[PDB]
Amino acid sequence: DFTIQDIRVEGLQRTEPSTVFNYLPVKVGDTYNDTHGSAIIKSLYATGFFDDVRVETADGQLLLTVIERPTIGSLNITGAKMLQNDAIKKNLESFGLAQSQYFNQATLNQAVAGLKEEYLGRGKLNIQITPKVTKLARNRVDIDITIDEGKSAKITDIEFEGNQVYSDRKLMRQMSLTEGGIWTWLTRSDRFDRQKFAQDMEKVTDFYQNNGYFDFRILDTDIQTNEDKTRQTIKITVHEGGRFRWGKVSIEGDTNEVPKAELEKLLTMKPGKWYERQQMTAVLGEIQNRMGSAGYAYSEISVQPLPNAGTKTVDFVLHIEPGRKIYVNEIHITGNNKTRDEVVRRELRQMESAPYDTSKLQRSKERVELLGYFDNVQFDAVPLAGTPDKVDLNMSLTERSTGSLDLSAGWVQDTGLVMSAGVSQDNLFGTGKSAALRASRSKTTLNGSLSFTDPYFTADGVSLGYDIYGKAFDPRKASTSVKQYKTTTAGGGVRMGIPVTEYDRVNFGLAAEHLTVNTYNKAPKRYADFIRKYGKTDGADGSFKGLLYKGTVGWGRNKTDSASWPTRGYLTGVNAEIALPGSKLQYYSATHNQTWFFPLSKTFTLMLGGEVGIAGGYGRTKEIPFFENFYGGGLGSVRGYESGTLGPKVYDEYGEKISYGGNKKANVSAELLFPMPGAKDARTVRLSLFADAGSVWDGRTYTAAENGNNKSVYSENAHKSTFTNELRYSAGGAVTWLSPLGPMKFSYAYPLKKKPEDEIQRFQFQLGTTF
Amino acid sequence: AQITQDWSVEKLYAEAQDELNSSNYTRAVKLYEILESRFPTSRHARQSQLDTAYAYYKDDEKDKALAAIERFRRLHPQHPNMDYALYLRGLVLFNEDQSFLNKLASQDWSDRDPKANREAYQAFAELVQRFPNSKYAADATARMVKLVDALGGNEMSVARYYMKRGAYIAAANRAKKIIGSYQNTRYVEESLAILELAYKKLDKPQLAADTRRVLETNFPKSPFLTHAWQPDD
């Protein structure tokens, strides 16, 4: 036995003997013979305290001669070329090495091994890593990183063994890896990566699997370097299995609540096409979503291939084994800062205490991600200690800022500078209550607006809000001399949205507006009649002031897989601007929208577009006001002639040409999209070529003008602006630069069936938004 | 390390505190770590790891301050100012949200998250259990009852919204949870009314009579007794 009387440790600098008094498993007045001779070693070696402690026992003052753990004061960073110095610093801080952080040499070895292996994952193989360890002040150490990088790791030949069933070249055209050429020097599109190599391997597995060849026995892969470790060669050996004919799939198992006939019907398969394993994965997914929507989340489906040779076929029996129907007990939400709890509970399905259906959970996920308030969302399902029928659905969010101020500028081919400024907010530090002030202004357009919306007026939801806009437009401007009139509209409008179903959402709107339209020096024929029938003449000019109480009906659906760089999906809708009667200028107009897509090739994609619209007159007003008419021809309309240059052209004083426009517009579009293989798949440019006609008609006929008719035929039937089924042939290519600084669309168009009156526009450039 | 000038610890502390007055911390913590690297044996190290935590509390990051205070706990578990650090934890974990661009003086505080609120509750429980008599006892219990009231109000808002949708079979279990584990709150005599309305709407006559007897025995005077409960807004 021994009583401790202030056991002293000697050989320290800052260990604070009281702290080690706390840390030793003993204290004052304790008996220790040999118990913790090594336990204290493990404790202080852990938690990063010391690395070499000599424990002695002599005269109650133990000589703990320790060399204190060196301190990483300032990490020296250099030699990093592809990866950033702050990046290596942060991913090294992930492993410790914080302020003085009791540095250890083994940790240095681990870190250098990690970085060298992660660089071998990249195109750097011969790395002369020399981390210079230097003895700075009392315990400071500076670790210098030096990465002697190789040039790159490109491939000379990509070949397989047993390459008898498919050609080498076409096989290279399908993999996501090419060889050095003339279109590979830029952006180092020939580097070698472990993860990219595994992705290409699984990709060629799916390739051989979809084509009808089974089990794809990959024998081996052999990588080889060269002298000085500069170039790379790859060799592969695989084994095929031939084609088959899979026609006898079947399912067996308990179906307590779901009828077996429904599962058999959803099992889409036929003895033809000999199989599709992608369709196999698809039917597994659909059977897991359907059988599992009745309330069986843990439905484990087993599949075993039954191969019958000779006839060279394989069958698939599906021994589904579901059970223990799953209900829901509670659903929490985490990471919902800056946002109310109700604004998230208001969207998702699967209310509570109901059977758990993934069919509603996926819909809830798409609904909540369609809101835009958050970036990433997950749907976890953790069971409870009352596991029979009780599970938990804790949520997780990744918040993103919503409100911001936009100050954007753009440049169009003819007008030039256009500005759009304003504030916007999707969450006014509360619920949604989205509001925004936005004012756009060009050399010819002026559009101020205040708007305030709330997605949920009622319990389910109504987009209720207000808006006061300041529309103004005047094209009496530089060289492009469009029909001269300055219009300015203001006022308010009730716009009520109402979902008809879970997917679509229609919206009606009524609005009380005031309008002031003032013409300029002597105007064409179609202006004097208006200013003497409804307007007001003033000397050699005309003006009008009044109310334009109007309504707007809208319904638009969009299901593309991406906003930018579109894919399978289609934007469609209907719209109707019907100036409701009660005030002057009783008119109405309808429109349509159809922009079908077709990815009928891995590289070339086509589209079938086209919109149709009629602008009818009713009530007192029989004619159509010019300032609300349609302007055919332009970039988005025909991609050919100049904007607003379709329809008829009338001479005015001093011989200027003006176009009226029709009340029946239509267009159909078709192009072919393929990217540019120059450097890499950098998302910056897209090339296409359109060949589309137009549509513009008047109905009447034009013979009287300012003593001169701009048409060849003296009595040119203006029922159509051309022969029957009004249209103007044209075509041409179109490149688009899709840098984040707005799109730059450059269209080079060639006309077709060129009449001697249609002014052409060979090259059109649009930069920015120009909305 | 760009000036590397010899100075006095008292003058460094004065400069650091007047920089705190003038919102200068990035150099203050760099004026903090330098004196700890040169002079390790100083309470100024603890003062630094606490006021840079207060600074990161004015700023956005928290992991650095929490790592520093946990390292301090691992090194000096017997310093008397530990409680303040504890309080600082309860401070940095509370997320006061000091920001004037979205001031909203109301700031019901029941919208941040249940995670941080529950963690702050656990932290304050550990606080009151560790030091029964520190430099702060009234403010701790005050903010504790405030945060438990905020949690109860969050649960009440969830139950209220669920009642706006018709999920009586779910609002039932929600109200059971509230009445069984969320006592001493202010949202009692309203959740009971919602439970009674749900039981009446679910054709539970005996259950409705029993819960209304509990109503009249637990709350003899309440406006929800005369006027049946109606979802506000």
mmCIF file of N, CA, C and O in Angstrom, chain A residues 209-280:
data_model
loop_
_atom_site.group_PDB
_atom_site.id
_atom_site.type_symbol
_atom_site.label_atom_id
_atom_site.label_comp_id
_atom_site.label_asym_id
_atom_site.label_seq_id
_atom_site.Cartn_x
_atom_site.Cartn_y
_atom_site.Cartn_z
ATOM 1 N N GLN A 209 -25.735 -5.528 -72.352
ATOM 2 C CA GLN A 209 -26.906 -6.129 -71.731
ATOM 3 C C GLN A 209 -28.193 -5.743 -72.446
ATOM 4 O O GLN A 209 -29.083 -6.583 -72.619
ATOM 5 N N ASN A 210 -28.305 -4.485 -72.872
ATOM 6 C CA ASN A 210 -29.500 -4.044 -73.580
ATOM 7 C C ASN A 210 -29.581 -4.665 -74.967
ATOM 8 O O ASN A 210 -30.673 -4.978 -75.455
ATOM 9 N N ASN A 211 -28.433 -4.858 -75.617
ATOM 10 C CA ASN A 211 -28.396 -5.411 -76.965
ATOM 11 C C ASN A 211 -28.820 -6.872 -77.023
ATOM 12 O O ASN A 211 -29.064 -7.380 -78.124
ATOM 13 N N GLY A 212 -28.914 -7.554 -75.889
ATOM 14 C CA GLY A 212 -29.352 -8.933 -75.859
ATOM 15 C C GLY A 212 -28.287 -9.957 -75.538
ATOM 16 O O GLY A 212 -28.544 -11.154 -75.701
ATOM 17 N N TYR A 213 -27.111 -9.532 -75.084
ATOM 18 C CA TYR A 213 -26.024 -10.436 -74.739
ATOM 19 C C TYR A 213 -25.877 -10.469 -73.225
ATOM 20 O O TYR A 213 -25.809 -9.416 -72.582
ATOM 21 N N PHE A 214 -25.829 -11.672 -72.662
ATOM 22 C CA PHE A 214 -26.045 -11.867 -71.237
ATOM 23 C C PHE A 214 -24.757 -12.209 -70.497
ATOM 24 O O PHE A 214 -23.871 -12.892 -71.021
ATOM 25 N N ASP A 215 -24.673 -11.686 -69.274
ATOM 26 C CA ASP A 215 -23.722 -12.048 -68.226
ATOM 27 C C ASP A 215 -22.306 -11.528 -68.448
ATOM 28 O O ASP A 215 -21.494 -11.581 -67.519
ATOM 29 N N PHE A 216 -22.003 -11.032 -69.655
ATOM 30 C CA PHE A 216 -20.848 -10.175 -69.934
ATOM 31 C C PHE A 216 -19.631 -10.477 -69.065
ATOM 32 O O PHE A 216 -19.189 -9.612 -68.302
ATOM 33 N N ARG A 217 -19.098 -11.691 -69.134
ATOM 34 C CA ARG A 217 -18.011 -12.069 -68.236
ATOM 35 C C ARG A 217 -16.759 -11.267 -68.573
ATOM 36 O O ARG A 217 -16.054 -11.572 -69.540
ATOM 37 N N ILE A 218 -16.481 -10.237 -67.772
ATOM 38 C CA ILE A 218 -15.268 -9.440 -67.921
ATOM 39 C C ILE A 218 -14.116 -10.187 -67.267
ATOM 40 O O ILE A 218 -14.118 -10.409 -66.051
ATOM 41 N N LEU A 219 -13.123 -10.581 -68.065
ATOM 42 C CA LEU A 219 -12.017 -11.365 -67.525
ATOM 43 C C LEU A 219 -11.084 -10.497 -66.689
ATOM 44 O O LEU A 219 -10.914 -10.728 -65.487
ATOM 45 N N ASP A 220 -10.474 -9.482 -67.303
ATOM 46 C CA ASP A 220 -9.471 -8.709 -66.582
ATOM 47 C C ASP A 220 -9.205 -7.384 -67.281
ATOM 48 O O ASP A 220 -9.550 -7.194 -68.452
ATOM 49 N N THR A 221 -8.585 -6.474 -66.533
ATOM 50 C CA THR A 221 -8.135 -5.179 -67.024
ATOM 51 C C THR A 221 -6.667 -5.002 -66.660
ATOM 52 O O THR A 221 -6.259 -5.330 -65.541
ATOM 53 N N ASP A 222 -5.879 -4.484 -67.599
ATOM 54 C CA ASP A 222 -4.438 -4.308 -67.434
ATOM 55 C C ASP A 222 -4.072 -2.887 -67.852
ATOM 56 O O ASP A 222 -4.204 -2.511 -69.019
ATOM 57 N N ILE A 223 -3.617 -2.098 -66.887
ATOM 58 C CA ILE A 223 -3.096 -0.766 -67.164
ATOM 59 C C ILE A 223 -1.579 -0.846 -67.264
ATOM 60 O O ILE A 223 -0.938 -1.648 -66.573
ATOM 61 N N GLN A 224 -0.995 -0.029 -68.139
ATOM 62 C CA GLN A 224 0.454 -0.041 -68.331
ATOM 63 C C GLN A 224 0.926 1.394 -68.510
ATOM 64 O O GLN A 224 0.283 2.177 -69.215
ATOM 65 N N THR A 225 2.037 1.738 -67.867
ATOM 66 C CA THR A 225 2.661 3.037 -68.064
ATOM 67 C C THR A 225 3.787 2.898 -69.087
ATOM 68 O O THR A 225 4.025 1.824 -69.646
ATOM 69 N N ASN A 226 4.495 3.989 -69.346
ATOM 70 C CA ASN A 226 5.635 3.993 -70.252
ATOM 71 C C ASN A 226 6.885 4.414 -69.482
ATOM 72 O O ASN A 226 6.868 4.564 -68.258
ATOM 73 N N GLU A 227 7.978 4.600 -70.217
ATOM 74 C CA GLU A 227 9.189 5.143 -69.622
ATOM 75 C C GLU A 227 8.938 6.567 -69.143
ATOM 76 O O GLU A 227 8.183 7.324 -69.760
ATOM 77 N N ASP A 228 9.551 6.917 -68.012
ATOM 78 C CA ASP A 228 9.418 8.202 -67.330
ATOM 79 C C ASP A 228 8.005 8.458 -66.820
ATOM 80 O O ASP A 228 7.748 9.542 -66.280
ATOM 81 N N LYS A 229 7.083 7.504 -66.970
ATOM 82 C CA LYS A 229 5.710 7.621 -66.477
ATOM 83 C C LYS A 229 5.016 8.853 -67.063
ATOM 84 O O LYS A 229 4.658 9.798 -66.357
ATOM 85 N N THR A 230 4.834 8.826 -68.375
ATOM 86 C CA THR A 230 4.209 9.942 -69.078
ATOM 87 C C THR A 230 2.963 9.542 -69.854
ATOM 88 O O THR A 230 2.004 10.316 -69.900
ATOM 89 N N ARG A 231 2.949 8.361 -70.461
ATOM 90 C CA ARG A 231 1.813 7.897 -71.243
ATOM 91 C C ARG A 231 1.209 6.647 -70.616
ATOM 92 O O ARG A 231 1.798 6.030 -69.726
ATOM 93 N N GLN A 232 0.022 6.279 -71.094
ATOM 94 C CA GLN A 232 -0.738 5.176 -70.526
ATOM 95 C C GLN A 232 -1.350 4.333 -71.635
ATOM 96 O O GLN A 232 -1.792 4.861 -72.659
ATOM 97 N N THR A 233 -1.368 3.018 -71.423
ATOM 98 C CA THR A 233 -2.007 2.076 -72.334
ATOM 99 C C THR A 233 -2.936 1.180 -71.530
ATOM 100 O O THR A 233 -2.633 0.835 -70.384
ATOM 101 N N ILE A 234 -4.062 0.809 -72.131
ATOM 102 C CA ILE A 234 -5.081 0.012 -71.464
ATOM 103 C C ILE A 234 -5.349 -1.238 -72.293
ATOM 104 O O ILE A 234 -5.378 -1.206 -73.527
ATOM 105 N N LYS A 235 -5.549 -2.355 -71.596
ATOM 106 C CA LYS A 235 -5.905 -3.609 -72.241
ATOM 107 C C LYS A 235 -7.035 -4.253 -71.453
ATOM 108 O O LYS A 235 -7.012 -4.261 -70.221
ATOM 109 N N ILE A 236 -8.029 -4.775 -72.165
ATOM 110 C CA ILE A 236 -9.194 -5.391 -71.544
ATOM 111 C C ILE A 236 -9.389 -6.777 -72.138
ATOM 112 O O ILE A 236 -9.120 -6.998 -73.323
ATOM 113 N N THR A 237 -9.857 -7.710 -71.313
ATOM 114 C CA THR A 237 -10.273 -9.028 -71.771
ATOM 115 C C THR A 237 -11.613 -9.370 -71.134
ATOM 116 O O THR A 237 -11.776 -9.254 -69.914
ATOM 117 N N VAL A 238 -12.573 -9.762 -71.971
ATOM 118 C CA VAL A 238 -13.949 -10.000 -71.570
ATOM 119 C C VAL A 238 -14.432 -11.295 -72.219
ATOM 120 O O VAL A 238 -13.678 -11.993 -72.895
ATOM 121 N N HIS A 239 -15.709 -11.607 -72.004
ATOM 122 C CA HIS A 239 -16.310 -12.813 -72.570
ATOM 123 C C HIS A 239 -17.804 -12.579 -72.727
ATOM 124 O O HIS A 239 -18.457 -12.113 -71.788
ATOM 125 N N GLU A 240 -18.340 -12.899 -73.902
ATOM 126 C CA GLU A 240 -19.757 -12.723 -74.176
ATOM 127 C C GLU A 240 -20.508 -14.029 -73.931
ATOM 128 O O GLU A 240 -19.929 -15.050 -73.551
ATOM 129 N N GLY A 241 -21.821 -14.000 -74.150
ATOM 130 C CA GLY A 241 -22.642 -15.173 -73.928
ATOM 131 C C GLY A 241 -23.646 -15.443 -75.029
ATOM 132 O O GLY A 241 -24.435 -16.388 -74.938
ATOM 133 N N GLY A 242 -23.630 -14.622 -76.076
ATOM 134 C CA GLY A 242 -24.560 -14.792 -77.176
ATOM 135 C C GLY A 242 -25.941 -14.251 -76.872
ATOM 136 O O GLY A 242 -26.252 -13.939 -75.720
ATOM 137 N N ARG A 243 -26.777 -14.125 -77.899
ATOM 138 C CA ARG A 243 -28.128 -13.629 -77.700
ATOM 139 C C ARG A 243 -29.041 -14.748 -77.201
ATOM 140 O O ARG A 243 -28.716 -15.936 -77.269
ATOM 141 N N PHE A 244 -30.207 -14.350 -76.689
ATOM 142 C CA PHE A 244 -31.179 -15.303 -76.169
ATOM 143 C C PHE A 244 -32.588 -14.919 -76.604
ATOM 144 O O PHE A 244 -32.758 -14.045 -77.458
ATOM 145 N N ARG A 245 -33.603 -15.574 -76.031
ATOM 146 C CA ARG A 245 -35.015 -15.262 -76.291
ATOM 147 C C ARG A 245 -35.776 -15.491 -74.986
ATOM 148 O O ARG A 245 -36.155 -16.620 -74.667
ATOM 149 N N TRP A 246 -36.002 -14.415 -74.238
ATOM 150 C CA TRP A 246 -36.615 -14.517 -72.917
ATOM 151 C C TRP A 246 -38.102 -14.197 -73.033
ATOM 152 O O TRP A 246 -38.477 -13.071 -73.374
ATOM 153 N N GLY A 247 -38.949 -15.188 -72.760
ATOM 154 C CA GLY A 247 -40.378 -15.027 -72.951
ATOM 155 C C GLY A 247 -41.273 -15.548 -71.842
ATOM 156 O O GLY A 247 -42.489 -15.340 -71.886
ATOM 157 N N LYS A 248 -40.702 -16.224 -70.844
ATOM 158 C CA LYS A 248 -41.518 -16.941 -69.868
ATOM 159 C C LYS A 248 -41.344 -16.418 -68.447
ATOM 160 O O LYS A 248 -41.159 -17.202 -67.510
ATOM 161 N N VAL A 249 -41.395 -15.095 -68.275
ATOM 162 C CA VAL A 249 -41.366 -14.520 -66.936
ATOM 163 C C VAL A 249 -42.642 -14.898 -66.192
ATOM 164 O O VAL A 249 -43.693 -15.132 -66.799
ATOM 165 N N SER A 250 -42.547 -14.975 -64.864
ATOM 166 C CA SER A 250 -43.690 -15.315 -64.029
ATOM 167 C C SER A 250 -43.456 -14.797 -62.616
ATOM 168 O O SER A 250 -42.318 -14.548 -62.210
ATOM 169 N N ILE A 251 -44.547 -14.653 -61.867
ATOM 170 C CA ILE A 251 -44.514 -14.117 -60.511
ATOM 171 C C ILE A 251 -45.267 -15.068 -59.591
ATOM 172 O O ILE A 251 -46.253 -15.687 -60.004
ATOM 173 N N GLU A 252 -44.802 -15.179 -58.347
ATOM 174 C CA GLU A 252 -45.443 -16.003 -57.332
ATOM 175 C C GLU A 252 -45.214 -15.369 -55.970
ATOM 176 O O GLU A 252 -44.168 -14.760 -55.729
ATOM 177 N N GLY A 253 -46.193 -15.514 -55.080
ATOM 178 C CA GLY A 253 -46.083 -14.944 -53.751
ATOM 179 C C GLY A 253 -47.406 -14.504 -53.161
ATOM 180 O O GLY A 253 -48.444 -14.565 -53.828
ATOM 181 N N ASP A 254 -47.382 -14.057 -51.908
ATOM 182 C CA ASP A 254 -48.597 -13.627 -51.232
ATOM 183 C C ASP A 254 -48.961 -12.205 -51.638
ATOM 184 O O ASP A 254 -48.097 -11.331 -51.751
ATOM 185 N N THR A 255 -50.254 -11.980 -51.853
ATOM 186 C CA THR A 255 -50.781 -10.708 -52.339
ATOM 187 C C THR A 255 -51.987 -10.297 -51.500
ATOM 188 O O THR A 255 -53.062 -9.998 -52.021
ATOM 189 N N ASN A 256 -51.804 -10.300 -50.176
ATOM 190 C CA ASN A 256 -52.863 -10.134 -49.180
ATOM 191 C C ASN A 256 -53.946 -9.131 -49.566
ATOM 192 O O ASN A 256 -55.138 -9.424 -49.435
ATOM 193 N N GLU A 257 -53.552 -7.948 -50.035
ATOM 194 C CA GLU A 257 -54.519 -6.916 -50.388
ATOM 195 C C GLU A 257 -54.554 -6.584 -51.870
ATOM 196 O O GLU A 257 -55.629 -6.288 -52.396
ATOM 197 N N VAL A 258 -53.419 -6.626 -52.555
ATOM 198 C CA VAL A 258 -53.397 -6.285 -53.983
ATOM 199 C C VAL A 258 -53.801 -7.506 -54.797
ATOM 200 O O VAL A 258 -53.304 -8.615 -54.530
ATOM 201 N N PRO A 259 -54.688 -7.371 -55.781
ATOM 202 C CA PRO A 259 -55.031 -8.521 -56.626
ATOM 203 C C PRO A 259 -53.873 -8.909 -57.531
ATOM 204 O O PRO A 259 -53.143 -8.056 -58.045
ATOM 205 N N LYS A 260 -53.709 -10.219 -57.720
ATOM 206 C CA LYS A 260 -52.612 -10.721 -58.542
ATOM 207 C C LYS A 260 -52.784 -10.313 -60.001
ATOM 208 O O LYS A 260 -51.800 -10.142 -60.730
ATOM 209 N N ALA A 261 -54.034 -10.162 -60.445
ATOM 210 C CA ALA A 261 -54.287 -9.790 -61.833
ATOM 211 C C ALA A 261 -53.682 -8.432 -62.162
ATOM 212 O O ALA A 261 -53.157 -8.229 -63.262
ATOM 213 N N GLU A 262 -53.739 -7.490 -61.217
ATOM 214 C CA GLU A 262 -53.139 -6.180 -61.446
ATOM 215 C C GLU A 262 -51.631 -6.289 -61.626
ATOM 216 O O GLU A 262 -51.054 -5.652 -62.515
ATOM 217 N N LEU A 263 -50.975 -7.099 -60.792
ATOM 218 C CA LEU A 263 -49.533 -7.281 -60.915
ATOM 219 C C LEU A 263 -49.173 -7.958 -62.230
ATOM 220 O O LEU A 263 -48.168 -7.608 -62.861
ATOM 221 N N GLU A 264 -49.979 -8.931 -62.661
ATOM 222 C CA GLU A 264 -49.726 -9.581 -63.942
ATOM 223 C C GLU A 264 -49.905 -8.605 -65.099
ATOM 224 O O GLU A 264 -49.149 -8.643 -66.077
ATOM 225 N N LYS A 265 -50.902 -7.722 -65.005
ATOM 226 C CA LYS A 265 -51.100 -6.719 -66.046
ATOM 227 C C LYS A 265 -49.951 -5.720 -66.090
ATOM 228 O O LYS A 265 -49.498 -5.344 -67.177
ATOM 229 N N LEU A 266 -49.466 -5.280 -64.927
ATOM 230 C CA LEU A 266 -48.340 -4.354 -64.905
ATOM 231 C C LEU A 266 -47.040 -5.006 -65.357
ATOM 232 O O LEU A 266 -46.097 -4.294 -65.713
ATOM 233 N N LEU A 267 -46.968 -6.338 -65.355
ATOM 234 C CA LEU A 267 -45.778 -7.047 -65.827
ATOM 235 C C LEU A 267 -45.770 -7.050 -67.357
ATOM 236 O O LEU A 267 -46.096 -8.035 -68.022
ATOM 237 N N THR A 268 -45.387 -5.904 -67.913
ATOM 238 C CA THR A 268 -45.320 -5.759 -69.361
ATOM 239 C C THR A 268 -44.111 -6.515 -69.907
ATOM 240 O O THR A 268 -42.964 -6.204 -69.571
ATOM 241 N N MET A 269 -44.376 -7.520 -70.735
ATOM 242 C CA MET A 269 -43.328 -8.339 -71.326
ATOM 243 C C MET A 269 -43.953 -9.193 -72.417
ATOM 244 O O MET A 269 -45.147 -9.503 -72.378
ATOM 245 N N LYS A 270 -43.131 -9.568 -73.391
ATOM 246 C CA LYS A 270 -43.561 -10.396 -74.505
ATOM 247 C C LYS A 270 -42.405 -11.282 -74.943
ATOM 248 O O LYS A 270 -41.240 -10.957 -74.682
ATOM 249 N N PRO A 271 -42.694 -12.408 -75.598
ATOM 250 C CA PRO A 271 -41.603 -13.246 -76.127
ATOM 251 C C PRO A 271 -40.765 -12.562 -77.196
ATOM 252 O O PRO A 271 -39.721 -13.104 -77.579
ATOM 253 N N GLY A 272 -41.184 -11.400 -77.693
ATOM 254 C CA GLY A 272 -40.454 -10.684 -78.720
ATOM 255 C C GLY A 272 -39.406 -9.757 -78.141
ATOM 256 O O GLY A 272 -39.379 -9.476 -76.941
ATOM 257 N N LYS A 273 -38.511 -9.298 -79.019
ATOM 258 C CA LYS A 273 -37.365 -8.437 -78.722
ATOM 259 C C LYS A 273 -36.320 -9.158 -77.877
ATOM 260 O O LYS A 273 -35.240 -8.604 -77.628
ATOM 261 N N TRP A 274 -36.631 -10.364 -77.407
ATOM 262 C CA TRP A 274 -35.749 -11.360 -76.809
ATOM 263 C C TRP A 274 -35.248 -10.992 -75.415
ATOM 264 O O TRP A 274 -34.837 -11.886 -74.666
ATOM 265 N N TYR A 275 -35.270 -9.695 -75.060
ATOM 266 C CA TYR A 275 -35.493 -9.177 -73.706
ATOM 267 C C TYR A 275 -35.180 -7.684 -73.704
ATOM 268 O O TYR A 275 -34.772 -7.131 -74.732
ATOM 269 N N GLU A 276 -35.382 -7.019 -72.569
ATOM 270 C CA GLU A 276 -34.707 -5.754 -72.287
ATOM 271 C C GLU A 276 -34.429 -5.694 -70.791
ATOM 272 O O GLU A 276 -35.365 -5.611 -69.986
ATOM 273 N N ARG A 277 -33.145 -5.765 -70.417
ATOM 274 C CA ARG A 277 -32.786 -5.776 -69.001
ATOM 275 C C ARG A 277 -32.999 -4.409 -68.365
ATOM 276 O O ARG A 277 -33.241 -4.310 -67.156
ATOM 277 N N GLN A 278 -32.897 -3.341 -69.158
ATOM 278 C CA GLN A 278 -33.333 -2.041 -68.664
ATOM 279 C C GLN A 278 -34.817 -2.079 -68.333
ATOM 280 O O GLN A 278 -35.249 -1.540 -67.307
ATOM 281 N N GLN A 279 -35.607 -2.754 -69.173
ATOM 282 C CA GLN A 279 -37.009 -2.979 -68.847
ATOM 283 C C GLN A 279 -37.151 -3.889 -67.634
ATOM 284 O O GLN A 279 -38.120 -3.782 -66.881
ATOM 285 N N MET A 280 -36.194 -4.789 -67.418
ATOM 286 C CA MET A 280 -36.218 -5.584 -66.193
ATOM 287 C C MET A 280 -36.086 -4.696 -64.960
ATOM 288 O O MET A 280 -36.868 -4.816 -64.008
#
